[PDB]
From Swiss-Prot, chain A:
One of the primary rRNA binding proteins, this protein initially binds near the 5'-end of the 23S rRNA. It is important during the early stages of 50S assembly. It makes multiple contacts with different domains of the 23S rRNA in the assembled 50S subunit and ribosome. Forms part of the polypeptide exit tunnel. This is Large ribosomal subunit protein uL4. Coiled coil: none annotated. The chain holds residues 104 to 154 of 205 of the full protein. Part of the 50S ribosomal subunit. It comes from Thermus thermophilus (strain ATCC BAA-163 / DSM 7039 / HB27).
From Swiss-Prot, chain B:
GO terms for molecular function: rRNA binding; structural constituent of ribosome. GO terms for cellular component: ribonucleoprotein complex; ribosome. SUPFAM superfamilies: Translation proteins SH3-like domain. The keyword rRNA-binding applies. It comes from Thermus thermophilus (strain ATCC BAA-163 / DSM 7039 / HB27). Keywords: Ribonucleoprotein, Ribosomal protein, RNA-binding, rRNA-binding. InterPro entries: KOW, Rib_uL2_dom2, Ribosomal_uL24, Ribosomal_uL24_CS, Ribosomal_uL24_KOW, Translation_prot_SH3-like_sf. GO terms for biological process: translation. Part of the 50S ribosomal subunit. Belongs to the universal ribosomal protein uL24 family. This is Large ribosomal subunit protein uL24. The keyword Calcium does not apply. Transmembrane segments: none annotated.
Swiss-Prot record, chain C:
The lineage of its organism: Bacteria, Thermotogati, Deinococcota, Deinococci, Thermales. Belongs to the bacterial ribosomal protein bL35 family. The gene is rpmI. This is Large ribosomal subunit protein bL35. GO terms for cellular component: cytosolic large ribosomal subunit. One of its GO terms (molecular function) is structural constituent of ribosome. Coiled coil: none annotated. It comes from Thermus thermophilus (strain ATCC BAA-163 / DSM 7039 / HB27). Gene3D superfamilies: 4.10.410.60. It comes from the Bacteria.
RNA sequence: AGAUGGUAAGGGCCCACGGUGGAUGCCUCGGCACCCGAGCCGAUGAAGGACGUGGCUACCUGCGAUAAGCCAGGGGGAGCCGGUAGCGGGCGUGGAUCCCUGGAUGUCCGAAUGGGGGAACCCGGCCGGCGGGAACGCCGGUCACCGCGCUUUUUGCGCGGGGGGAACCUGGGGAACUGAAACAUCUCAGUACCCAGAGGAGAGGAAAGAGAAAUCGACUCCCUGAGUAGCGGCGAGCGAAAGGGGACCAGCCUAAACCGUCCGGCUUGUCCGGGCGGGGUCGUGGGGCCCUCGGACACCGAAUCCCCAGCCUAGCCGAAGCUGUUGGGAAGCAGCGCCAGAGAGGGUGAAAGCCCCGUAGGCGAAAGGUGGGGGGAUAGGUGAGGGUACCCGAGUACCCCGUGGUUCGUGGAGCCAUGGGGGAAUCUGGGCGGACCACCGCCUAAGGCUAAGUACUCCGGGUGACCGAUAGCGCACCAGUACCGUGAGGGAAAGGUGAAAAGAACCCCGGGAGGGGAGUGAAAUAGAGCCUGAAACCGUGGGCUUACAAGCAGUCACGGCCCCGCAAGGGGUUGUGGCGUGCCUAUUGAAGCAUGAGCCGGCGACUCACGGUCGUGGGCGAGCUUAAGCCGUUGAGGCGGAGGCGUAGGGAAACCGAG
């Protein structure tokens, strides 16, 4: 199920593999700006997975 | 304890309803019911009086208590929240971006 | 909780590998006195059963 | 001669409106469940009570004659003199009220304890004080009993005990219904209950163990082993252990031989015994005494003590919005912005990230409670070889009779415990490895202590595909109350005005109650056990209908009358005609003169757990799958193959095997 789900969202073309994170610290403004240039206008719910 | 709240006895604005925007000094603050007396909400009491002593009581339209949340403090600038700053010794309270 | 195997039945009946139940021929221990050599021999071999086979299955289940 | 509208004392059906009543909806300080925290109180008088206490006080709460409270230390920073308004009188920035810590006072009952007693009452002894105070009375201190050590004796001195606790825990006692479709052995069950004891736990515990591995290595708890081994009127049913995988981890003191010593006893001795000190603690056996070793500095290190971190017992900081717009009321709709390590939730007159309270994140302790988590000290502890054969826990081992425990019901019946009788030995000793013998092998009884992992939840906190006032604790409300019992004991009902009391001044009818105005409110069929207001049931007004009529009350047709529509048509009523044996249950059969139901409204009955069997959707496939549990999370998943099902069957078994 896990792989299938990932493969699904990816098949639709939504699984983005990011790496660059200008978000230096725990500040929402930074992410909101980073996501903005990331193509994330907020018109879509997202599962931000990160370490 | 913890019954304390916003302002005390001084200048205060009212964003309630029937007396929105209005301003006046808060003459009383009952913490139990969490409400203060200003100069806005004032309704007419018809009753003569509950106590027989002193025949005349008054058809007075005196000040009615008012929920202490609809009222907001104020200073040189109109209507501001409340920050606090421990003084060089005591514990005074500064407004949004100014003193007291 | 946990069906208890009917010990009274296991000690006297073994199930075949397929799904059948088998047990010794009845009447051969006491009634004896001088029966035809056929009888005593016929009683020597075990056998299959019918409906109650399913019944006795529902006992030695965990077994 | 004939024909057939009207009439309602009353009744019926329908429609409007009200009364009664309190269903439904929504609301929730309360309740339930799970998780986490925390866990004893008492003769320094507990638990739980009685009486009393406010200027005026019925009850609740608080407190105790100093009696809504007194002293001090913190916290807090404008209001306060509880629920509680009113008469009446005060306190607070010289920082109160409140919260947290400690302290003081604390009547009488109650383990109740000077004595008595029908709990909250009555009466004293001893010392000292008060009133003129010897008779009387009051005030403070003191005097119960039992256990152990001191007291040589008597008497006193000191230490402890007593009683309470929701559940949990150990020990001493210990049922029956029920199951066996009867019943008696069995089962229910060592359960319920009684009793004594223990503390945040209890119990158990460093093998005289298990049991077949020339293996493991205290105890306790969770998986598994396993519904196996076995038990059993071989009925119903009952039901282990070893081993493997996890949590936790811990090991110690003493008795005896032998040396010193103090006491009193006598048969006076190189002694008997008691008390204290040293010595000693083992199963590759250990210790004692003598000899030899060099046998000392270090090495081990607390479960006890000391300091500290941390933690509970009050709290503090804390980002971000303003005007329009509808309204009784913006937080809704609009326009233009902002914060976010904070968009969980609650409130504000309605629907708020930015208004209040909070949340994220981060601060805090003079005092009291906790604390090996960290560090420090103290107790205690550590070796070899030879000889000597001194010691190694007694009415015990052991044996027999009677029995309990164990899975073990006398079974071939061992082992652990032991009421009766007989009755040893100290390592050439003694138990055990399922009667007995032999061999092989495990272990050292008859003395005590030991944390943690585990159980429970009165108490606090968090959470919920948990309830939402006939539910949920019996109790959301001054309920273990009212009320019912002689007494154990039984045991209810009862929540909601509104945003705010603005709770309707004043006039009118009236004795009052209750109304009609007026007035408040957005709303008064929201007006006071007042939100929503269903049904039975009562009532007034209106349409149609009925006094020659025969019936499960309806249904089918035609017509008249009344009402809606442009029309055809639809609704209400019922004149006449046709047809017609209520519902439920139980039965071969009920309309039944068989059962049940006065009517309405609400609560009310095939569930869950584990195991099994068939079907079914889906993953993998000679493979499949994990259980406790560990890691992570704070509504995340992952690891964990111990173990289980399957791949070979057949036989009672030895055994053999596509047979
Ligand atoms: Mg033969
Ligand atoms: Mg099996
Ligand atoms: Mg009317
Ligand atoms: Mg008390
Ligand atoms: Mg008085
Ligand atoms: Mg009062
Ligand atoms: Mg003396
Ligand atoms: Mg009986
Ligand atoms: Mg009978
Ligand atoms: Mg039994
Ligand atoms: Mg313990
Ligand atoms: Mg556990
Ligand atoms: Mg088990
Ligand atoms: Mg059972
Ligand atoms: Mg000694
Ligand atoms: Mg010593
Ligand atoms: Mg026996
Ligand atoms: Mg004996
Ligand atoms: Mg011993
Ligand atoms: Mg213990
Ligand atoms: Mg609900
Ligand atoms: Mg009575
Ligand atoms: Mg209303
Ligand atoms: Mg008609
Ligand atoms: Mg019936
Ligand atoms: Mg009949
Ligand atoms: Mg029938
Ligand atoms: Mg009938
Ligand atoms: Mg009958
Ligand atoms: Mg009847
Ligand atoms: Mg099932």
């Amino acid at each position: 199920g896990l792989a299938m789900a990932v493969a699904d969202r990816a098949r639709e073309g939504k699984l983005l593999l990011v790496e660059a994170f200008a978000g230096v610290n725990g500040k929402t403004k930074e992410f909101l700006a980073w996501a903005k240039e990331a193509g994330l206008d907020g018109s879509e719910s997202v599962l931000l997975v990160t370490g | 304890r913890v019954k304390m709240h916003v302002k005390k006895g001084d200048t205060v604005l009212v964003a309630s309803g029937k007396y929105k925007g209005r301003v006046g000094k808060v003459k009383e603050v009952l913490p139990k019911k969490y409400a203060v007396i200003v100069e806005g909400v004032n309704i007419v009491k018809k009753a003569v009086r509950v106590s027989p002593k002193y025949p005349q009581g008054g058809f007075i339209e005196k000040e009615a208590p008012l929920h202490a949340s609809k009222v907001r403090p104020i200073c040189p600038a109109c209507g501001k929240p409340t920050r606090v700053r421990k003084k060089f010794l005591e514990n005074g309270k500064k407004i949004r971006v100014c003193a007291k | 909780p946990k069906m208890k195997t009917h010990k009274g039945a296991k000690k006297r009946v073994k199930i075949t590998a397929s799904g059948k139940v088998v047990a010794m021929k009845t009447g051969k221990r006491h009634l004896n006195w001088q029966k035809s050599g056929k009888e005593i021999r016929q009683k020597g071999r075990k056998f299959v059963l019918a409906k109650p086979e399913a019944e006795r299955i529902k006992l030695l289940l965990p077994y």
